[PDB]
């Protein structure tokens, strides 16, 4: 009864889940279960809008195609879904982020990603822009750029 | 725990939906191999249902239960004013 | 008068407070002007906590209560054979007043240690599956426990109806008499049971002790023990009484009712504390007791519904660990037309097995242990066991309201174990059954009789049985 | 239930997560080696 | 007597008599008020105050209100008056025809029959409908759980057998509507004239209504069934016949028993259900059961709290349950009507002491058959496509069209007797129609109208 | 038995005890007598050794009710005070006796009649006021009642009168009057 | 003391008394009364009013009855007397074999030993059962407890180590019945005059017998485990001996507590339990226990409700055992018996160092076996046996044949099963299942090992099967 | 007043479950006895007298109408709570919403399968 009713006097809930935090993924924010109220597209603009439901309905897709991979394996899946788990998996490592508070807990140095720099790395990645590149290319890191370095520098070391 | 028994429950209904599928998909393959898999999947369909229906009479017993012992909290303490 | 009198001070929650009475005995019978009665359970400084056996519909506030100075008690004897009493014992089946000289109070406490001796006499129930497989004595406590409609009240009319061989003869150590408690259950149930058993003509040593489903809680909470008092008189004077408690559901039901009605804490599932107490004290007073004591016996057979094939529930466990072993119905069995549906690796008789006649024993070892085989199987020697298994099976099946003799149990059950109708197919043990039967009952009533006389199979007498059912099993189809 | 095999725990849900790891290691280490 | 309001809590009411206080049960008489309010006795709790529940709204009551003691229980008037009106609770006319002007009144809280007026055998109440008198049927005095609700014709089922009982048996029925929908209440009285079996212009109505809505008090919910068993009893006892009583809702009759028990500031039970549950609803079912001068059979409609059948409320009234008639969607996508599914419908006389052994061996037949059609359709050899034909037009053959639709479809309505019934399963069974097209025993009465189909 | 209850009702202990002895003092027609005994008995029961032996707890009930039995005896009382007094010390409620008799005083303060009307006013107001509200205010009774006033004094107020007759309230002040027309003015 | 009933409801008692109330645990005398009625004082309610549970029926007292103090608490006879004797919660003999002659009498309400009695010594316990002796052995002079439900084999396992423990004992031995069956008790006795355990023509009997069973009202059943306890404690402490105690059942005694607690006056705890529940509890365990005055090995039968394991009675017994033994209805109904629970007994000497690292890495790798294939069950469950490696599918067939050589044949068992009991040795046990883990029978069928004692019968049955 | 006057209203309670929290509140404050979730008796019946006053009134009555759409939030989609279950059998079906049909891009998130108007067919325009 305390969060339930909590929630109707709030603007934007973050809602933290420790499922993700067992992913290692900080912060924690669970995206299908964060809400705003301005995400609107006539407030934030339909570019905006349109890579936040973009990115939550292939989050949702994943979660939909990960039974059919506990059961079936992943070989034995579609191309388009072996994209869309590819795709998905980079969207979540790369909501991911250092901050500057938990540079003890990581060793990372703090990152403050502006807003542009947000929705273009995001709508690249549902874009197929970074079909090549790994997934632990995303993890902790800031822009894409960023990614695209750590990408270029796990390759040269191995 | 309502809530353990709700996720097995959820999980196992799945894994019964996703085999009784690749049953059908089976099925149609074989118009050795294709008819193995039809009867694998077949009957892990089975055993899924088997443990849906266990699963089910133990959720209704756990629920009911909650229900009963919040009541009991309840009234114990109103009966203590 | 306020020692032999008092005043109702208030009424409803079916609990009378009443102001006076100062010389009344706890759990003694207090009696209101309207004619109904009650228990005093709570006596406290000012008042006394009345339960009711009846609406308190009829009790207003300002009545008077007098005492009648008798613990709760019932009619005990001979008279009650073959009458359908209600909770106190009065009779309802409109054929005047039972004439006892007798009364028991319901809540004397069971026979302690030495009063008593194990269970050694069999208590034929008639049934195939139970008196080979789940063997019960005089003196045990049964339980039948299942869902709804899955033949419980089936198997304790069949046992009522097989007394019927016993009672007729001349052997007076081998009578049996029956006591049935119907606690709310639909009084047209009780009424087609109490035809069926007058049918049978197994009404003349039957006691029909009734508190069905429109009958206040207390009178349902009291029937068992004023059954259990009918049968007392019989242990406690050289007889055997059976008694059937059908069933103990409802009356936990109705005792949770009255104790909540009362604001005592609910536990596991609201019921009070003391609701295993409820059925120990009265499952306790079946025994057997020792020479010393009239050698008589109580045997009681307490039904218990589960609730989806739930039998870890509270009150379900509660009489487990109460009784002596347990006769488990499953529904399975019963939609798939195995009938009686008695789960033989689940139903148990812990202290029968010593109580089983010596010809049973002798077939139903072998049959025990091939359908354990057939259990455990479920090449060319586990089809074997299939066969066998699958065979034992259909000859457990039993009709309704026809219960055998011990001795061609025996035979029907040797033709089975020792292997004669391993190539007849299945779906036709059932007929091979009873034509066999037919036979061996007009042809060969001798080896019966002496079957019947010996209690074992003599090897004369086995001799005989493997050419009658060699001979039988020639000429069938 | 979309997630609800995972989402649980268990034999189904762990293997499910070793399954994938195993999978996309693998290409990750066949799409590191070819940049 | 007279006493006066001394607390109003909600719908619990405490009254204190100055002198001769009401026993329990009775009904008293709110003084002064625009419409009439009852309060039904509960407790005596001394200090000559009693403690009543309330079968209307109690605002604007005032302490010290004078209240009238009625020296009963509720009483309604009972008699052929009471056919073809609506009443409620308190046996008031809610239709806005007028006084309902019987000769006699009687109280809705009584006693079940003794136990030496009860008829020893079971008997088969036969409703000419087929796969109800084949398949599940109903026993005369028994008590039938109606499952399924909306859009499987449940109404029209209702309808058919008040109309169906009233021509073969010559009896007469009850609706008790427990926790009705106002709208849907308005609904069914209209199907009900339109159909027929209520009459508004000459005497000739089949089904007296007993109307107890849901934005009524929890205590006028919980006696509605009294009121309208009330009736039932006065058709059987006094007219000697062989009433129906539908309930609908069962469960609502619990719950309003439930919340009267929670007010009267009793501790609940398991789940949360009163902890007279198992004696509310046997002191209500034990009332329908056959006596020596008729019978009243229930048809009870049934709901599953959380589809959970271990529920109290569904466990407790299942107990008394003689026979189960499930409405089925998937059946009524099939065109059959009615809609009953012919495999999960039981009935406890199904059984050869009863029925007889050959009925329960063609119901036997035809369960087998049905079963294996359906094992059947799992896959999709030489005889299997024999049971699928064979199986086809049982199923065909279960349907049947209602007297109370011909205004809907114009086809005759079939009111099938039991040997009909028996003799037409038995011939499909033996395989005497195998030369009829499968469509030949769609919406037809006994075989003989199938044949004469087929002939076309 | 039938009781002859109060024209006023007073609940708890104190009712209780107070409506059974008005109840019995009104069978025998000695309701003035009672009254003047329980006034007596309370102002005994002030005493500071009494009170004191009274309200001990420690004390067994049985010497208790034997010293308020002599000690009612040497006043030479009704049976009906006595009976009461011994029925409050049996049942071990004599910490409620003054209560009890204020309560039954209170019944027969309107059993005379007397009816409660307290007028409040800004600063203490002279007799001649006084009378003419006396005249115009019984005017307000139905059948035989005469006036208890208790003029209070308030400035807070700041002129007018609150009036209180039994229940009914007139609100005669000036500061309500001033808030009505300045919420008027606001709304 | 002489006081009087004012309050009767059910099996509490309030009494008023004058002068002289007397103490809490006091015992005080009913007066007109056929057989002994005793009260025992919980509360002082204030104006001279105790509160008090009675030991047997409150039928038929009236409220001015009069009652009186004996001054002290109930008090049991204790001694040699006391050895093949019956004595129900108040010490009365109940075999009818006449008076108890004993020299001195104990109170049965008594503080434990203190903290510098304790004994740490750990000796092993050898039962010859294998599964507890390999999995959770118990101890000599320890706190044993076998956890169940109803009917998994409570009864045929105390009964069991009555037979291999107690009969081959070299000290004395009590059993006090707590609300259990009366024919079990006739049959216990019966059992051990025949056996010779009991002898009634002389003093050569070892076995002290205390029963309130569960006929009796709460009171006997609250405090029968007292007055075993009592018995016991004077063999230990004021004869030095070494004491085996069974107690069946011990969750009775707390249950009981229940019926008295809503009658008490209390508010209830969870499960509608008395809030004194493991206050009391620790009350009467600690009683049970070895000094260094003597040794007390325990035994104790604990009903679990509704096969509940986290219910407040068991969920607190389990702090108070050195050893417990979790039967299980899952496992008994696959034929299992014993039905324990491989991975939920335990036991505090299960340390290489008491039991050897032998027996300790045998009892581990057991262990770890069972619970690698109880997580394979759910792959096992939908997929079946096919979609496992060839390392799960040894792990598998391992773990069962692990599983059926857990079972035993009892020899209180024949009477139901016709199968002689076995009695395993420590070093066959461990031999056995060091062989199963080894690998050396990965050729046996799995049924080959089920109902057997040593290893050696599994072959011979294997045998016998082919 | 509306519905009275031959007028037509719809009315949006938003939502039904805080109201019930409301009621609840000022019941357990009175002293009122609890009931399962600490709600009282005669919570059912608040919400049935709210309910049943949205009606279509016949041509006789002036031939107003109200309509009623009351909002329930479920909590995990339990609809087998206390307040879900007395408001979901008062009404005449329901629209039932999803989260994981919302996050799908379905949306209105609503749920087809479970949702129901038991008015039906006889609420649309033929061409619908
Ligand atoms: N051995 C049998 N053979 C055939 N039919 C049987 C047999 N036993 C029971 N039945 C049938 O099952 C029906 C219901 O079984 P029965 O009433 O005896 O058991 P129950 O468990 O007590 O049911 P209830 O829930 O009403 O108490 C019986 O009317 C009878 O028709
Ligand atoms: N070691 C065993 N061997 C065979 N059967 C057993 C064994 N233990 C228990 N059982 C079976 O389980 C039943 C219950 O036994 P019991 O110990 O008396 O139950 P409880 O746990 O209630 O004391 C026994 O009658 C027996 O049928
Ligand atoms: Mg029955
Ligand atoms: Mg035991």
């Not at chain 3, 100075?69 to 007043?97: F, M, S």
């Not at chain 3, 066998?388 to 035979?411: C, D, F, H, N, W």
């Amino acid at each position: 009864p305390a969060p339930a009713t909590t929630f109707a006097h709030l603007d934007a809930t973050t809602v933290l889940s420790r499922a993700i935090a067992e992913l290692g993924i900080y912060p924690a924010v669970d995206p299908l279960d964060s809400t705003s109220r301005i995400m609107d597209p006539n407030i934030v603009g339909s570019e905006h809008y349109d890579v936040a439901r973009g990115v939550q309905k292939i989050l949702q897709d994943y979660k939909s195609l990960q039974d059919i991979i506990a059961i079936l394996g992943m070989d034995e899946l579609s191309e388009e879904d072996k994209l869309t788990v590819s795709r998905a998996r980079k969207i979540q490592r790369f909501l991911s982020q250092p901050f500057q508070v938990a540079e003890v807990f990581t060793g990372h140095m703090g990152k403050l990603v502006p807003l542009k720099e947000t929705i273009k790395g995001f709508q690249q990645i549902l874009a197929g822009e970074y079909d090549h590149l790994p997934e632990q290319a995303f993890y902790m890191v800031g822009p894409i750029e960023e990614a695209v370095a750590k990408a270029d520098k796990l390759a040269e070391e191995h | 725990t309502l809530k353990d028994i709700t996720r097995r429950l959820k999980s196992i209904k799945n894994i019964q939906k996703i085999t009784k599928s690749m049953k059908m998909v089976a099925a149609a393959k074989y118009a050795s191999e294709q008819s193995a898999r039809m009867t694998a999947m077949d009957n892990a369909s089975k055993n899924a249902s088997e443990m849906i229906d266990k699963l089910t009479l133990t959720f209704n017993r756990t629920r009911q239960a909650v229900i009963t012992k919040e009541l009991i909290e309840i009234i114990s303490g109103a009966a203590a004013l | 008068d306020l020692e032999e009198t008092g005043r109702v001070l208030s009424i409803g929650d079916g609990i009378a407070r009443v102001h006076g009475l100062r010389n009344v005995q706890a759990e003694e019978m207090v009696e209101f002007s309207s004619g109904l009665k009650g228990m005093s359970l709570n006596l406290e400084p000012d008042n006394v906590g009345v339960v009711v056996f009846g609406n308190d519909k009829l009790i207003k506030e300002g009545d008077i209560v007098k005492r009648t100075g008798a613990i709760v008690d019932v009619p005990v004897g001979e008279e009650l054979l073959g009458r359908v009493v209600d909770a106190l014992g009065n009779a309802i089946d409109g054929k005047g007043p039972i004439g006892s000289k007798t009364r028991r109070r319901v809540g004397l406490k069971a026979p302690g240690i030495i009063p008593r001796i194990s269970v050694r006499e069999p208590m034929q129930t008639g049934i195939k599956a139970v008196d080979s497989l789940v063997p019960i004595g005089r003196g045990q406590r049964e339980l039948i426990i299942g869902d709804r409609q899955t033949g419980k009240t089936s198997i304790a009319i069949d046992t009522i109806i097989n007394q019927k061989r016993f009672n007729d003869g001349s052997d007076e150590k081998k009578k049996l008499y029956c006591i049935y408690v119907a606690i709310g259950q639909k009084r047209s149930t009780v009424a087609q049971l109490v035809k069926r058993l007058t049918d049978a003509d197994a009404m003349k040593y039957t006691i029909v002790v009734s508190a069905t489903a429109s009958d206040a809680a207390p009178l349902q909470y009291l029937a068992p023990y004023s059954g259990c008092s009918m049968g007392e008189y019989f242990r406690d004077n050289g007889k055997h009484a059976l008694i059937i408690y059908d069933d103990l559901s409802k009356q936990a039901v109705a005792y949770r009712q009255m104790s909540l009605l009362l604001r005592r804490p609910p536990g596991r599932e609201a019921y009070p504390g003391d609701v295993f107490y409820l059925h120990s004290r009265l499952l306790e007073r079946a025994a057997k007791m020792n020479d010393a004591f009239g050698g008589g016996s109580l045997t009681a057979l307490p039904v218990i519904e589960t609730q989806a094939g739930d039998v870890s529930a509270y009150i379900p466990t509660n009489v487990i660990s109460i009784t002596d072993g347990q006769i488990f119905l499953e529904t399975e069995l019963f939609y798939k037309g195995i009938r009686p549906a008695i789960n033989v690796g689940l139903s148990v008789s812990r202290v029968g097995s010593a109580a089983q006649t010596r010809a049973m024993k002798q077939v139903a070892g072998t049959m025990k242990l091939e359908l354990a085989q057939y259990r455990e199987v479920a090449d060319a020697a586990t089809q074997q066991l299939l066969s066998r298994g699958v065979r034992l099976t259909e000859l457990l099946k039993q009709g309704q309201y026809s219960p055998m003799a011990i001795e061609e149990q025996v035979a029907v059950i040797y033709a089975g174990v020792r292997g004669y109708l391993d190539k007849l197919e299945p779906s036709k043990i059932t007929k091979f059954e009873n034509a066999f039967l037919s036979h061996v009952v007009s042809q060969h009533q001798a080896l019966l009789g002496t079957i019947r006389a010996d209690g074992k199979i003599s090897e004369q007498s086995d001799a005989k049985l493997k050419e009658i059912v060699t001979n039988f099993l020639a000429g069938f189809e | 239930g979309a997630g609800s095999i995972r989402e649980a725990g268990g034999a189904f849900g762990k293997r499910e997560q070793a399954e994938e790891e195993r999978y996309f290691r693998a290409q990750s280490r066949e799409q590191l080696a070819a940049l | 007597a007279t006493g006066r309001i001394v607390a109003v809590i909600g719908a619990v009411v405490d009254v204190q008599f100055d002198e001769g206080l009401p026993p329990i049960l009775n009904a008293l008489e709110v003084q002064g008020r625009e419409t009439r309010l009852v309060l039904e006795v509960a407790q005596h709790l001394g200090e000559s105050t009693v403690r009543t529940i309330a079968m209307d709204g109690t605002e604007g009551l005032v302490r010290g209100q004078k209240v009238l003691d009625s020296g009963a229980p509720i009483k309604i008037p009972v008699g052929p008056e009471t056919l073809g009106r609506i009443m409620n609770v308190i046996g008031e006319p809610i239709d806005e025809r007028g006084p309902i002007k019987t000769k006699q009144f009687a109280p809705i809280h009584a006693e079940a029959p003794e136990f030496m007026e009860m008829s020893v055998e079971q008997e088969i109440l036969v409703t000419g409908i087929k796969v109800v008198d084949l398949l599940a049927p109903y026993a005369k005095g028994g008590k039938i759980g109606l499952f399924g609700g909306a859009g499987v014709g449940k109404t029209v089922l209702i309808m058919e057998l008040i109309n169906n009982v009233a021509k073969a048996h010559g009896g007469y029925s009850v609706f008790a509507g427990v926790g009705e929908r106002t709208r849907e209440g308005n609904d069914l009285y209209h199907e009900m004239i339109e159909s027929g079996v209520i009459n508004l212009k000459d005497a000739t109505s089949k089904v007296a209504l007993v109307y107890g809505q849901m934005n009524e008090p929890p205590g006028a919910r919980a006696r509605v069934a009294l009121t309208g068993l009330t009736v039932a009893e006065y058709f059987r006892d006094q007219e000697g016949q062989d009433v129906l009583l539908f309930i609908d809702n069962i469960f609502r009759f619990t719950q309003a028993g439930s919340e009267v028990s929670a007010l009267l500031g009793r501790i609940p039970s398991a789940v949360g259900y009163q902890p007279t549950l198992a004696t509310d609803m046997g002191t209500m079912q034990e009332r329908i059961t056959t006596t020596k001068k008729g019978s009243i059979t229930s048809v009870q409609a049934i709901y599953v709290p959380a589809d959970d059948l271990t529920d109290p409320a569904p466990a407790t009234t299942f107990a008394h349950l003689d026979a189960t008639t499930v409405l089925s969607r998937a059946i009524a996508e099939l065109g059959i009507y009615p809609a009953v599914d012919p495999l999960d419908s039981t009935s406890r006389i199904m059984d050869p002491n009863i029925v007889g052994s050959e009925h329960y061996d063609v119901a036997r037949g035809v369960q087998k058959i049905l079963q294996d059609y359906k094992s059947l359709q799992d896959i999709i050899s030489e005889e299997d496509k024999l049971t699928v034909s064979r199986a086809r037009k049982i199923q065909r053959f279960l349907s049947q069209p209602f007297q109370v639709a011909e205004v809907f479809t114009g086809h005759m309505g079939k009111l099938v007797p039991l040997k009909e019934t028996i003799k037409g399963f038995q011939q499909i069974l033996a395989g005497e129609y195998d030369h009829l097209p499968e469509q030949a025993f769609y919406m037809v009465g006994p075989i003989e109208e199938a044949v004469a189909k087929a002939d076309k | 038995a039938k009781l002859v209850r109060p024209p006023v009702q007073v609940y708890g202990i104190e009712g209780r005890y107070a409506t059974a002895l008005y109840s019995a003092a009104s069978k025998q027609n000695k309701l003035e007598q009672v009254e003047k005994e329980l006034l007596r008995v309370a102002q005994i029961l002030k005493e500071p050794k009494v009170a004191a032996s009274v309200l001990n707890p420690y004390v067994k009930r049985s010497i208790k009710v034997k010293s308020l039995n002599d000690i009612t005896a040497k006043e030479r009382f009704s049976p009906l005070t006595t009976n009461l007094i011994n029925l409050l010390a049996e049942n071990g409620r004599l910490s409620n006796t003054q209560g009890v008799v204020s309560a039954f005083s209170t019944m027969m303060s309107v059993h005379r009649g007397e009816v409660p009307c307290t007028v409040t006013s800004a600063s203490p107001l002279e007799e001649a006021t006084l009378s003419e509200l006396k005249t115009v205010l019984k005017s307000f009774l139905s059948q035989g009642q005469v006036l208890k006033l208790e003029a209070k004094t308030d400035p807070s107020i700041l002129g007018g009168m609150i009036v209180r007759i039994g229940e009914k309230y007139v609100d005669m002040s000036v500061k309500t009057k001033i808030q009505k027309l300045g919420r008027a003015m606001r709304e």
